Design a binder for these strands. Structure first.
Ligand SMILES: [Mg+2]
Ligand SMILES: [Zn+2]
Ligand SMILES: [Zn+2]
Ligand SMILES: [Zn+2]
Lengths: 257, 44, 79, 49, 99, 132, 115, 64
RNA sequence: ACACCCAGCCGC
């Protein structure tokens, strides 16, 4: 087995940042981990909207689109639900769905803000994350919005509403020693956050026998997952994809010669 | 089906045999309400 | 001997002879070359042109009324 | 009649679309949308193979 | 039958100023709603992608398909007799990156 | 290359440049003539001999389509059976290969004073490849 | 009108194969792996892990078209070690990489959360 | 017409941050400090909150 | 469900 031994460190750990440093690994591994942050981490978001009544100033597709982008808490429940195309249910079942009901109606002179707090979920483990509230539509007197929504489990490849991150920042080799970007005028370029050189120098000297093994991350959560769980599920998902490829190629080699 | 008005927003009862007129405010423009059949919306 | 034409098969000659041959093979004409895995008649037409075994003779009209009958087999192909 | 309906006539089996680049195609290839492909047809003659 | 991969088509842009404005291509099916060209093919068409629309014609007789395949292909019709120079050529990014 | 734009798919999924395209179709009941009236009614295949193979079941009892109904290409949003001097269909179809949902249906009286109707169809237009 | 379904980028319908092996006859002991319905995410890591193997003479990948969803990974090794074995070793090595990294990340979370 | 739920570029939630931002304009703060009081560090979300029009408030004036 | 007339707009 010709595989090296990556290590991790964590700089600071808030409820929205999980900033970590990975050492002793390839560039491709770190980049694919970042892409799995963006794409291949499943969360729960609304995907099946049924508008019973909408007399608001915003039409039905707009309300459905703004409902899809509302994040939902999926801390543990996403790992136990299934995909709606990978279940034995007819259309939707509570084994892979969560129900949502919205029956807001304005009968006051002041305007009514249909915040995310008015989405009444069925299972009390998913909820809009602000439970500062995500408004969906403003209503005046005599306007109602009745709808039922179903939220599935999906990847960020399928849509960006399933993207759990909020702009992961991936920086390697901050002082530009390994010449992977060539500054036309190095001294006018600002030093980055993880910089070891002083203010007098511009960039680190060139390293001929050098490869990049240092990777700084700023994985930031939209709210659907804890920032621990985004990484701890991304690594699991990448491992699962590689295991699926392994067993498929084993089946291919078995029926080859 | 049945119609609602454009001024008072009150439902009316006309079935292809009556002149177009609101029963209360007498408004010549009247809309049709949203259908009872439900349509699937992809939040995608 | 009364053959004052170019002894080289022109590109228009190639185009229309392959076209006629492909349409004929599509209408179940016997193929003059061995088959080893083509379905579309155009590929069969190119193979028959390269084998120079096409059953086509072309008549070229000189600009006075007189004609000249050439065989595609006795012409010179462009490849 | 002569210029507008003998020299130049409207034709069946023709398509028109906005064009976008594709550096992953050869120079002798054109990308075609699925609806144009499903609408326009080629008449093949049933050969015994 | 429906048009599939490998069907010969004539592909044309107005104004049809010269013989290079109407050349033949092979069809590749791609899953969006636009005709996608090669980049270097845009120089004989005098085309760009700022909203140019561009026409497609399909033969349905094997003699016509053969005539386009052996007279009006893109590779066969690269060097023009207008200037005995190649009317196709490397353009834009591929030209400024090969330098 | 050559004046083209690469776009972020995730941004477009998040609402970047997403828009709707309202189209409105107008039809009036022109009862001018001796017996050439065209009453708004759902055209059944028993009478109204001139017909099409469009899907004639989404209309209402008033010869009209309802708001909030999914409408595909080449459908029917009006039932206008005009008397042949039994009757024939003079109804409008949708524009070719259009899509959308009926937003509003207006029934009113026009300048001539006839039974005038308008249908508004709304289709979302997510930015595709090929949009300027 | 011609938009593909958004799930077509990562889902196999009935009939198509996830991975195929095509022996390349231009040079001896080389193979093409046509992995379907996937993207650069596995291509880059598989290419790098095969490049790390000293008995691999060529290891590359391409995506033939961004609108399509195939990746082609070409591998050529020495005439002592079959390329399918090289791909197998690379996949299991990346499994070990990801598993060890996951364990160390979980220890890092526990150590930061405890104080 | 209304504030987007998510920033187009990154994906940070900015739907819940409109009203409070208006409050910080009602509390005589500059727009830059109002953005910095919300955690909108990247300039994409600052583009979202800074350059948005509340046309839904205009649409609410008309009768339903 | 057209046919003329007019206007506006797209690419070169
Ligand atoms: Mg142009
Ligand atoms: Zn189920
Ligand atoms: Zn009224
Ligand atoms: Zn942002």
């Amino acid at each position: 087995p010709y595989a090296n031994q990556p290590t991790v460190r964590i700089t600071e750990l808030t409820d929205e940042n999980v900033k970590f440093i990975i050492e002793n690994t390839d560039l491709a591994v770190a980049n694919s981990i970042r892409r799995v942050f963006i794409a291949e981490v499943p969360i729960i978001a609304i995907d099946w909207v049924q508008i019973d009544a909408n007399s608001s100033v915003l039409h039905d597709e707009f309300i459905a689109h703004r409902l899809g982008l509302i994040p939902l808490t999926s801390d543990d429940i996403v790992d136990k639900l299934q995909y709606s195309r990978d279940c034995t249910c007819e259309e939707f079942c509570p084994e892979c769905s969560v129900e949502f009901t919205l029956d807001v109606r304005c009968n006051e002179d002041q305007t009514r803000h249909v915040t995310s707090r008015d989405l009444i979920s069925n299972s009390p483990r998913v909820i809009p994350v602000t439970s500062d509230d995500i408004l969906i539509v403003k209503l005046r007197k005599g306007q109602e919005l009745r709808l039922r929504a179903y939220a599935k489990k999906g990847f960020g490849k399928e849509h960006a509403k399933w993207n759990p991150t909020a702009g992961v920042a991936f920086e390697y080799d901050p002082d530009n020693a390994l010449r992977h970007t060539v500054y036309p005028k190095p001294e006018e370029w600002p030093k980055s956050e993880y910089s070891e050189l002083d203010e007098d120098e511009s960039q680190a000297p060139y390293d001929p026998n050098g490869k990049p093994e240092r990777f700084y991350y700023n994985v930031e959560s939209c709210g659907s997952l804890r920032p621990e769980t985004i990484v701890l599920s991304a690594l699991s998902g990448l491992k699962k994809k590689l295991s699926d490829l392994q067993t498929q190629l084993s089946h291919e080699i078995q029926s080859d010669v | 089906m049945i119609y609602i008005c454009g001024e008072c927003h009150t439902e009316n009862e006309i079935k292809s045999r009556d002149p177009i007129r609101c029963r209360e405010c007498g408004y010549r423009i009247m809309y049709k309400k949203r259908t009872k059949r439900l349509v699937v919306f992809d939040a995608r | 001997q009364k053959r004052i034409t170019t002894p080289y098969m022109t590109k228009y000659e190639r185009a229309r002879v392959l076209g006629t041959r492909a349409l004929q093979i599509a209408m179940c004409a016997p193929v003059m070359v061995e088959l080893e895995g083509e379905t579309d008649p155009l590929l069969i037409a190119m193979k028959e042109l390269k084998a120079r075994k096409i059953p086509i003779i072309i008549r070229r009209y000189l600009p006075d009324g007189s004609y000249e009958d050439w065989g595609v087999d006795e012409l010179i192909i462009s490849d | 009649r002569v210029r507008g309906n003998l020299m130049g006539k409207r034709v069946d089996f023709s398509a028109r679309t906005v064009i976008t680049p594709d550096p992953n195609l050869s120079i002798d290839q054109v990308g075609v949308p699925r609806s144009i492909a499903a609408n326009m047809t080629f008449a093949e003659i049933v050969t015994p193979f | 039958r429906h048009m599939c991969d490998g069907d010969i088509v004539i592909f044309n842009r107005q104004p049809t100023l010269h013989k290079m404005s109407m050349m033949g291509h092979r069809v590749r099916i791609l899953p969006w709603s636009t005709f996608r060209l090669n980049l270097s093919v845009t120089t004989p068409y005098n085309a760009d992608f700022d909203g140019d629309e561009m026409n497609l014609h399909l033969p349905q007789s094997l003699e016509t398909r053969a005539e386009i395949q052996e007279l009006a292909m893109v590779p066969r019709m690269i060097v023009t007799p207008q200037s005995n120079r190649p009317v196709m050529g490397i353009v834009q990014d591929t030209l400024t990156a090969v330098r | 290359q050559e004046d083209s734009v690469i776009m972020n798919r995730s941004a477009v999924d998040r609402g970047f440049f997403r828009s709707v395209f309202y189209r409105s179709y107008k039809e009036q009941e022109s009862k001018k003539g001796f017996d050439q009236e065209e009453v708004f009614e759902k055209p059944t295949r028993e009478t109204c001999q001139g017909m099409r193979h469009a899907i004639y079941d989404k209309l209402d009892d008033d010869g009209l389509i309802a708001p909030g109904v999914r409408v595909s290409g080449d459908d029917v949003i009006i039932g206008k059976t005009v008397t042949l001097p039994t009757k024939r269909d003079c109804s409008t179809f949708l524009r070719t290969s259009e899509t959308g949902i009926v937003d509003q249906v207006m029934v009113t009286l026009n300048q001539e004073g006839y039974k005038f109707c308008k249908i508004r169809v709304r289709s979302v237009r997510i930015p595709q490849i090929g949009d300027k | 009108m011609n938009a593909p379904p958004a799930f077509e980028s990562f889902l196999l319908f009935e009939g198509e194969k996830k991975i195929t092996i095509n022996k390349d006859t231009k040079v001896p002991n080389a193979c093409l792996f046509t992995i379907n319905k996937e993207d650069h995410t596995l291509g880059n890591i598989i290419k790098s892990q095969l490049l790390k193997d000293p008995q691999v003479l060529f290891a590359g990948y391409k995506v033939p078209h961004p609108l399509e969803h195939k990746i082609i990974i070409r591998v050529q090794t020495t005439p002592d070690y079959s390329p399918q074995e090289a791909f197998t070793n690379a996949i299991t090595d990346l499994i070990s990489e990801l598993s060890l990294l996951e364990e160390r990340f979980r220890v890092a979370i526990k150590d930061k959360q405890e104080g | 017409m209304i504030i987007p739920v998510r920033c187009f570029t990154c994906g940070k939630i900015v739907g819940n941050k409109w009203e409070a931002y208006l409050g910080l304009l009602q509390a005589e703060y500059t727009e830059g400090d109002a953005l910095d009081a919300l955690g909108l560090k990247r300039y994409c979300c600052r583009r979202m909150l800074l350059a948005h029009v509340d046309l839904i408030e205009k649409l609410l004036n008309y009768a339903p």
